[PDB]
Design a protein around this ligand. Structure first.
Ligand SMILES: NS(=O)(=O)c1c(F)c(F)c(-n2cc(CC3CCCCC3)nn2)c(F)c1F
Ligand SMILES: [Zn+2]
Length: 257
């Protein structure tokens, strides 16, 4: 099945998921000079004060921190969005080296990692219905650069030893995702897709301009995770990113000048 290796990686995905060559695939390069300020774009509304984290899971491609999305507890609204999108999970993509790892790029620059806070449009009732809709998901993307530690990330780092291999999960309650956000909510936005199979074209991407800084020790601990299951040959979970895809008939909009 699909993964990030030589023989099952992004260049192969189109054989099982032809939408890989579709008209609104993600990620993309964000050409900052070509993005257009849209003065009518509203500020983002990130309402995470009542967020209820439940569990962290190594799913063999990344780790997901999962939330209770059975009520409007942690929601994203405003910006380019109409309606209310509920936080279901967050996860990261990262590199084997500090100079690669992000999915989106900025003027072709790659960051060490990229955080995806995944939200679904409540008008569709559940996440599985939402992914079948062009406006089903809103994913808030945040770049990570290596420098100072991010204190709000440490609880995540601390638990990774307990979910080293594919299929392992751990309780992960009372985690506050507000601790993962940069100061500014200035963003770029465009219509795109899931960046892993099934690559569905259901995402409004909202990518923050300001990266967060994480320490070298923090990202080193991401790189100690495994793609494999327990008792299988060890394959370090690194370079779990899809490269930039063609922009095609899309314009990236900026919330800021
Ligand atoms: N990196 S990302 O764009 O933010 C990103 C995500 F946030 C995802 F949640 C998924 N994801 C995994 C499933 C399983 C089922 C696929 C279809 C039926 C319901 C769910 N669906 N969506 C995904 F593939 C992805 F690429
Ligand atoms: Zn992702």
């Amino acid at each position: 099945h699909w993964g990030y290796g030589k023989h099952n990686g992004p260049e192969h995905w189109h054989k099982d998921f032809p939408i890989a060559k579709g008209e609104r695939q993600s990620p993309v390069d964000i050409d900052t000079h070509t993005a257009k300020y849209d003065p009518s774009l509203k500020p983002l509304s990130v309402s995470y004060d009542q967020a209820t984290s439940l569990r962290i899971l190594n799913n063999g491609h990344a780790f997901n921190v999962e939330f209770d999305d059975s009520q409007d507890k942690a929601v994203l609204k405003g910006g380019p969005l109409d309606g209310t999108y509920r936080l279901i999970q967050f996860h990261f993509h990262w590199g084997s080296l500090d100079g690669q790892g992000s999915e989106h790029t900025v003027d072709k620059k790659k960051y060490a990692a990229e955080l995806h806070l995944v939200h679904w449009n409540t008008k569709y009732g559940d996440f599985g219905k939402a992914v079948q809709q062009p406006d089903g998901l809103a994913v808030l993307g945040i770049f990570l650069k290596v420098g100072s530690a991010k204190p709000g990330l440490q609880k995540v780092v601390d638990v990774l030893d307990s979910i080293k291999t594919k299929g392992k999960s751990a309780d992960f309650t009372n985690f506050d995702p507000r601790g993962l956000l940069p100061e500014s909510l200035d963003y770029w936005t465009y219509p795109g897709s899931l960046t892993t199979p099934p690559l569905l074209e259901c995402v409004t991407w909202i990518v923050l301009k300001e990266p967060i800084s994480v320490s070298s020790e923090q990202v080193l601990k991401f790189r100690k995770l495994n793609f494999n299951g327990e008792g299988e040959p060890e394959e370090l979970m690194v370079d779990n990113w899809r490269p930039a895809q063609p922009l095609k008939n899309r314009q990236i909009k900026a919330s800021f000048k």
